[PDB]
Design a protein around this ligand. Structure first.
Ligand SMILES: Nc1ncnc2c1ncn2[C@@H]1O[C@H](COP(=O)(O)OP(=O)(O)NP(=O)(O)O)[C@@H](O)[C@H]1O
Ligand SMILES: Nc1ncnc2c1ncn2[C@@H]1O[C@H](COP(=O)(O)OP(=O)(O)NP(=O)(O)O)[C@@H](O)[C@H]1O
Ligand SMILES: [Mg+2]
Ligand SMILES: [Mg+2]
Length: 1144
């Protein structure tokens, strides 16, 4: 594929309206970006007029009113600009993306079939559908507007700073790289530590996933405690990594604060020096500092836009590669050579063909079907022969490279390729129902049909009664959630589609796994005896279909050299309000669980409060310094500025130390809690019935994924997020008290407009994040329909329904387009209103301060201090409200955690109060009057009044047929399942009233699937007995005729084994499992299909090994072949849950 396209190529699908929208959005973004430095300049001018005219109250009042009106104007401009930018950019991006998706799907469906074999795969095409969102609905939708906005902010801030005071602007410009470098180092270290911690968490998740997968053996052989120990060790490694990550984050933030405070101290001293020499005034100095800092931050904030631009260039290069490719069928489908009377004579002629994917091999050979016109052919040959290949050749999916295939004496290469597919009606292995309605699914076979025609096609051919008995009635949306799998009924629908097409020659490929739904009724309906020409390719083990066709024309080896009418069945065969109180109780319970380290939290909280206070003090200092700038006494101003700079240096050191302290302690408690929670979740999971594991929702991978997610999110919400809330509350209190002390009433007016500022700042944070949600989730219906169409491209092209699919795609994509337009309008209007109210609040507060000064109630210094302090308070409160949704999510996750932990188990693995057991049992087992319905199928009851009996030390060899009991017995003898009314007697004792684990220490399991653990075979053998050492390993496979091959391995015992290890043979791993069972040294032995997948010598050796093992101990054996089990005391037979002859 191309490396990338030009940035200007992203706007290929932009029309005039899109150009107008982009122009308006660019203008709005530029004005919105430039507004903030203009606000800083106007604030500086207001402060100058407010502090430089203490003697002249009239002039200062007039100028303060003037600049408050300027603030209102800036607020209105921000409102208009933000509205225009957000709405126009979102809507134009959505429109261009929708057009691009429509044309991409059209081009992909118009492509030739072989294009999906040699060129990009189907999975690549659906991935392109999915990633089109993050490409175009992201780069040109909001990232471009953000880039323009941030360039405007950076340029305007630099211009304002260098036009107000150029010396201070240069100093701040020198300052900015220091903070940039500190932030970059902090982010790099944090990302590295996060990667390491994620790797450790992935290892722990793998451990829990394997435990849940092999819970079959993890419970049978006690050792779920060992799984808990392994999980604890992995979590301890992850906990050390988390401690390192938290310490790194704390040091990074502390260094950032230290550098910021020291640099601002130097800047304030230099500003005082400049004010002394009458080069400037205090307001312009502060505005210059803030404007240059804002410009630097804006320049920093445009990097994600560039990253999105690069990713979009790559993905758009891929999409344009797919779009611009010219299909092969376009020149194949040429001027009208359609006939006027089809007879149904398909002659394959001498043609051979090879797939372009693997041209070396010739799948097709020298043969010709020569389908008789008006008569049915039914070819049955091999499983890997060109049956589906010749089917595709008939429909001209692939152009033959040798010879030619012709219809009614006319070459297929010369036909319409549209009319041709109109004659042939195809039935495939997969019905391939689309996301649209059932009636639309029927209609896409023939677009020029109405409801009566659909009803007659469904009724006369096949049936339609199943459609009526549907929740949605006559018309139903099958989709992916509206309806579920209907089995052969889905196939039924396909047949109906084939019956909406005009009656002609048909290609009916397969009806496998349809039961009676669409085999007998399929051959009865669909005019399998009527019409002209058919090709029934179904094998179905020769389900009487051969007699239907006049000729068989077998396809052995890939040829029809054997053809005619006969009874030769052997056709060769070469191949084949929500509950907040519950949430609060959950927090109380979790914190009670987190008691053993409450002390840590307190110390963290202490750091928390300090940090909050420090922030407040910083604000105060700035305001104080600003006030000191407007003082005629030069020496007094020098002394005050020096004092404030020294205090700021001290504050920087304290901020570094205490910020590191708070982050370290809160991350410590957070990591410890999330670890304790994970251990508790695993311990509760491993103490559940197998039926609980049977639960579909309790999938091994899902069980692991759910655990990880709930653990991490609750951890974050309770540990990292809280520190923020506490420090922000500290800031609020100190800021509030300082304001009402320096100047009350003004602070009261400020706290009155507090919610307005909080809302405006939280909307600013949301704007920084982005005002468009999950774009992939917005186009879910469209993307799943497109994926279904692309995966089934052969069926789409067979029915000539590309245009119908494209128009359905447009119909599915329109509602998201309208929703995006309205969402953009609402978001822009709300953001603009919030910003306008914010600036109105600023103007009102400043004007009230000026009025208070005029009336002699207060002074410039106190009013300015209260103002700045309260504004930083509002910023902190807005940050807290921004972080609150994470607390909501954490509450949901911890509710899930607590409902999992509080779940009770009916079969408790350990019973502290139970009957004691002798060290050595007797070995007798009595399964008396047992019966139960497997939890998977409660409707299907298994076993009726079974009376199985195994004597002390004797061998039982129950066999049965496949699927009738067998394993179920060993799933009940050892309490994997609960009989409805059964009795299990062991050593003259019922097992229900017993400790369970105590006998399961004396039971050995060798299931059908030879499960293996970890990476070394030695530990796999040792799993049977936790104190195996090496002598029992001699008593292991060493003494079970399974030592030669393991010694032949390069590493011997410590040989890499497992899913990621060496894939051993079935017999070798089976005797590994046998060795594990011997190491268990169980008094009661349970064999389970030990002679199923072994070679002759391996089967023999396993036979003597098991015969030696069973000596003197009761054993239950199941095996299909009776020759191995004839040398047993008793043999039992079961069938359909009933008890057959058992004595012999
Ligand atoms: N695009 C392809 N490229 C390469 N090999 C393919 C391709 N499609 C199918 N094959 C293989 O070609 C061989 C011939 O089988 P084919 O006639 O394609 O289907 P089939 O096995 O007859 N299907 P079915 O009738 O359902 O049992 C098989 O090994 C296929 O897996
Ligand atoms: N994991 C399972 N989920 C659902 N049903 C099950 C499961 N395991 C066993 N059954 C049912 O238990 C009954 C008896 O199956 P069973 O004979 O134990 O199977 P098997 O061990 O796979 N047989 P075989 O392959 O001949 O050794 C059948 O109704 C099965 O469908
Ligand atoms: Mg086929
Ligand atoms: Mg089995």
């Amino acid at each position: 594929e191309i490396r990338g396209v030009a940035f200007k190529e992203l706007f290929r699908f932009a029309d005039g309206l899109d150009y107008v929208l982009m122009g308006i959005g660019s203008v709005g973004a530029f004005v919105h970006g430039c507004s903030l430095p203009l606000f800083l300049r106007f604030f500086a001018d207001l402060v100058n007029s407010f502090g430089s005219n203490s003697n002249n109250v009239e002039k200062m009042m007039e100028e303060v009113l003037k600049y408050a009106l300027y603030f209102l104007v800036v607020g209105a401009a921000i409102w208009a600009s933000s509205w225009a930018e957000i709405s126009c950019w979102m809507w134009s991006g959505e429109r261009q993306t929708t057009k691009m998706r429509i044309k991409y799907l059209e081009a992909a469906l118009n492509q030739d079939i072989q294009f999906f074999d040699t060129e990009v795969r189907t999975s690549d095409v659906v991935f392109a559908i999915n990633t089109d969102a993050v490409m175009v609905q992201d780069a040109i939708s909001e990232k471009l507007g953000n880039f323009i906005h941030y360039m405007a902010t950076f340029v305007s801030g630099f211009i304002v700073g260098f036009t107000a005071v150029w010396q201070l602007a240069l100093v701040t410009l020198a300052v900015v790289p220091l903070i940039a470098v500190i932030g970059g180092i902090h982010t790099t270290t944090l990302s590295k530590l996060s990667n390491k911690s994620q790797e450790s968490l992935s290892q722990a998740g793998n451990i829990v996933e394997q435990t849940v997968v092999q819970i079959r053996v993890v419970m049978a052989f006690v050792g779920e405690s060992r799984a808990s120990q392994a999980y604890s060790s992995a979590l301890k490694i992850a906990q050390k990594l988390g401690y390192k990550t938290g310490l790194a984050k704390g040091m990074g933030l502390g260094a950032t604060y230290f550098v910021v405070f020291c640099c601002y101290a130097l800047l304030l001293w230099y500003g005082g020096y400049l004010v002394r020499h009458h080069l400037t005034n205090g307001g312009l100095a502060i505005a210059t500092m803030f404007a240059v800092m804002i410009g630097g931050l804006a320049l920093g904030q445009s990097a994600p836009s560039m990253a999105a631009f690069a990713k979009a260039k790559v993905a758009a290069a891929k999409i344009f590669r797919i779009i611009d490719h010219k299909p092969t069928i376009e020149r194949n489908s040429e001027s009208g050579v359609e006939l006027d009377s089809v007879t149904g004579l398909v002659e394959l002629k001498n043609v051979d063909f090879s797939y372009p994917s693997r041209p070396d091999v010739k799948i097709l050979n020298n043969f010709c079907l020569s389908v008789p016109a008006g008569k049915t052919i039914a070819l049955v040959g091999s499983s890997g022969s060109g049956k589906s290949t010749v089917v595709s050749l008939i429909e001209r999916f692939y152009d033959p490279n040798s010879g030619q295939v012709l219809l009614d004496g006319q070459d297929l290469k010369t036909l319409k390729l549209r009319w041709l597919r109109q004659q042939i009606g195809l039935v495939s292995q997969e019905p391939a129902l689309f996301a649209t309605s059932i009636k639309e699914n029927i209609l896409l076979g023939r677009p020029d049909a109405d409801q009566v025609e659909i009803e007659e096609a469904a009724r006369v051919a096949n049936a339609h009664s199943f459609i009526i008995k549907l929740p949605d009635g006559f018309d139903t949306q099958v989709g992916e959630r509206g309806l579920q799998l209907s089995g052969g009924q889905k196939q039924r629908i396909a047949i109906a589609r084939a019956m909406l097409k005009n009656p002609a020659i048909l290609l009916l490929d397969e009806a496998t796994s349809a039961l009676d739904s669409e085999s007998e009724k399929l051959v009865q309906e669909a005019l399998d005896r009527f019409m002209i020409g058919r090709t029934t390719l179904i094998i179905a083990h020769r389900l009487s279909t051969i007699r239907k066709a006049d000729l068989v024309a077998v396809l052995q080896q890939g040829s029809v050299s054997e053809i005619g009418t006969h009874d030769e069945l052997f056709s060769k065969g070469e191949n084949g309000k929500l509950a907040f109180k519950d949430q609060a109780n959950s927090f109380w319970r979790l914190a009670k669980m987190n008691s053993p380290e409450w002390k840590y939290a307190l110390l963290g909280s202490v750091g928390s409060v300090i940090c909050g206070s420090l922030s407040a003090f910083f604000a105060y200092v700035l305001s104080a310094v600003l006030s000191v700038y407007y003082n005629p006494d030069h020496e007094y101003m020098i002394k005050q500025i020096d004092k404030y700079c020294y205090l700021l240096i001290g504050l920087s050191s304290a901020a570094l130390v205490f910020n590191t302290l708070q982050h370290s302690f809160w991350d410590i408690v957070g990591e410890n809690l999330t670890k304790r929670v994970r251990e508790k979740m695993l311990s509760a999971v491993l103490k559940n019935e197998m039926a609980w594991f049977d639960q579909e929702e309790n999938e091994s991978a899902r069980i692991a994924a759910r655990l990880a997610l709930d653990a991490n999110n609750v951890r974050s919400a309770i540990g990292d997020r809280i520190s923020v809330i506490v420090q922000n509350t500290a800031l609020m209190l100190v800021a509030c008290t300082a304001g009402f002390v320096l100047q009350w009433r003004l602070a009261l007016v400020l706290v009155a407009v507090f919610p307005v500022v909080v809302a405006a700042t939280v909307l600013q944070k949301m704007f920084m994040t982005g005002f468009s949600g999950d774009l992939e989730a917005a186009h879910a219906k469209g993307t799943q329909l497109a994926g279904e169409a692309i995966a089934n491209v052969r069926t789409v092209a067979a029915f000539n329904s590309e245009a119908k699919i494209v128009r359905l795609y447009t119909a599915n994509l329109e509602p998201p387009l309208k929703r995006c337009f309205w969402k953009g309008q609402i978001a822009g209007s709300g953001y603009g209103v919030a910003q306008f109210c914010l600036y109105a609040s600023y103007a009102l507060g400043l004007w009230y301060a000026s009025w208070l000064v005029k009336h002699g109630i207060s002074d410039f210094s106190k009013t300015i201090r209260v103002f700045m302090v309260l504004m930083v308070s509002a910023n902190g409160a807005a940050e807290t409200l921004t972080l609150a949704p994470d607390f909501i999510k954490g509450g949901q996750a911890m509710r899930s955690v607590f409902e999992l932990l509080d779940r009770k188990t009916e079969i408790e693995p350990d019973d502290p109060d139970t009957t004691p057991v002798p060290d050595r049992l007797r070995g007798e087992v009595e399964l008396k009057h047992i019966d139960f319905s497997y939890p998977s199928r409660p409707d299907i009851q298994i076993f009726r009044d079974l009376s199985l009996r195994a004597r002390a030390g004797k061998t039982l060899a129950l066999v049965g047929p496949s699927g009738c009991g067998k394993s179920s017995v060993i799933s009940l003898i050892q309490r994997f399942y609960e009989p409805s009314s059964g009795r299990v007697m062991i050593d003259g004792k019922d097992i229900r009233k017993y400790n369970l684990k105590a006998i399961r220490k004396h039971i050995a399991i060798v299931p059908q699937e030879p499960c293996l653990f970890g990476t070394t075979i030695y530990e796999n053998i040792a799993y049977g007995h936790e104190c195996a050492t090496e002598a029992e390993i001699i008593q292991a496979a060493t003494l079970a005729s399974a030592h030669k091959f393991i010694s032949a391995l390069p590493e011997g015992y410590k040989t890499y084994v497992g899913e990621r290890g060496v894939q051993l043979s079935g017999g070798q791993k089976q005797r590994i499992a046998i060795a594990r069972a011997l190491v268990r040294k169980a008094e009661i032995m349970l064999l389970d299909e030990a002679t199923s997948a072994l070679d002759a010598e391996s089967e023999r050796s396993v036979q003597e090994a098991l015969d030696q093992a069973c000596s003197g101990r009761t054993s239950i054996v199941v095996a299909h072949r009776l020759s191995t089990i004839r040398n047993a005391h008793v043999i039992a037979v079961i069938d359909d849950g009933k008890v057959a002859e058992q004595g012999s």
